[PDB]
Amino acid sequence: SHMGTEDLKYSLERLREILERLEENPSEKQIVEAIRAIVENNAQIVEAIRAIVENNAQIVEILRAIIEALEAIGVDQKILEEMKKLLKDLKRSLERG
Amino acid sequence: SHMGTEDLKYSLERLREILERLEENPSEKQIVEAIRAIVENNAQIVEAIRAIVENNAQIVEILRAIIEALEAIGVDQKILEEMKKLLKDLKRSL
Amino acid sequence: EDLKYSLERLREILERLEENPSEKQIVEAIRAIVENNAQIVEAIRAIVENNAQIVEILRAIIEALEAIGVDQKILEEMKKLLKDLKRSLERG
């Protein structure tokens, strides 16, 4: 279970610990242990990015609903147009799965 | 081509397989194998982040447009200064 | 921004390791990775803090729309979407 970016700081600090332990008394098993740790840190980095991406997708949904609110109340299409173009573009260049 | 975060998931599983093999039977060839796959998974991560940072600035520009519209149509100055301050306190952090 | 340098540095070190695997090279690569992962975590951290400020801006925006008199239907829609973002938001 990924809980937040503190998972990333804790797994990074553990990796820094292994690193100094490696450079002090190098050894193959220490090298494998560093790689093991790197994989744990990377697995948590990936989990964070997936969350952030879903987050931004959900932000786009809120932004679309907001544009609808402004339209449902009679705001000028002159104004809505610029917002609709920017959101269209963002929806195109959005990082997704 | 970076297609999305599914790339990160796919390069990560690959690195995990390499790691299991390395751990059941270590070897110098697999250690370099793993380090190569780490640089790969990391390159894609840097690609996703790059894309997220550009996405984020696009989101902020849309927020500014929304707030500028709100002012145009006569929202109250209390909430208006409240939103403009949030944007300024974001502009600092960036 | 400075994420680039940390990745390029790491890809050049990978070359030197590719040609003549040494304990020196391997350890250099790992340290270079740690630095790259350090930059990557820091970038993610900044992004996560900024999205929590984006959430607050969205809340205030929804309040300005309710204040002006947006229909309950679209309003509830917006309130539900932000509640869902708040619940799934990446944080510390």
Contacts of A90 (CB under 8 A, 6+ apart): A60, B55, B58, B59, B62
Burial of A63 (0-12, 13-18, 19+ CB in 10 A): buried
Q: How close B27 gets to chain C, by Cα (Å)?
A: 12
Residues of B in contact with A90 (CB under 8 A): 55, 58-59, 62
Whether residue C29 contacts residue C13, with contact meaning beta carbons closer than 8 Å, is answered with yes
Q: Is B67 part of the contact surface with chain C (CB cutoff 8 Å)?
A: yes
Taking alpha carbons only, the member of C62, C63, C54 closest to residue C91 is: C54
Burial of A81 (0-12, 13-18, 19+ CB in 10 A): exposed
Cβ of C40 within 8 Å of Cβ of B42? The answer is yes
Q: Is A13 part of the contact surface with chain C (CB cutoff 8 Å)?
A: no
Burial of B6 (0-12, 13-18, 19+ CB in 10 A): exposed
Contacts of B86 (CB under 8 A, 6+ apart): C53, C56, C57, C60
Resolution in A: 1.9
Contacts of A16 (CB under 8 A, 6+ apart): C34
Distance set, CA B28 to CA B22, B23, B69, C25, C65 (Å): 9, 12, 62, 12, 63
End-to-end C-alpha distance for chain A, whole angstroms:
19
> C23-68 and B28-72 are packed helices; what angle lies between their axes, rounded to 10 degrees?
20
- Enter the tokens of residue A24: 């002090």
* Per-residue buried b or exposed e for C14-37, using 16+ beta carbons within 10 Å of the residue's own CB: beebeeebeeebbbbbbbbbbbbb
DSSP string, C57-79: HHHHHHHHHHHHT--HHHHHHHH
Using H for helix, E for strand and C for coil, what is the string for A29-84? HHHHHHHHHHHHHHHHHHHHHHHHHHHHHHHHHHHHHHHHHHHHCCCCHHHHHHHH
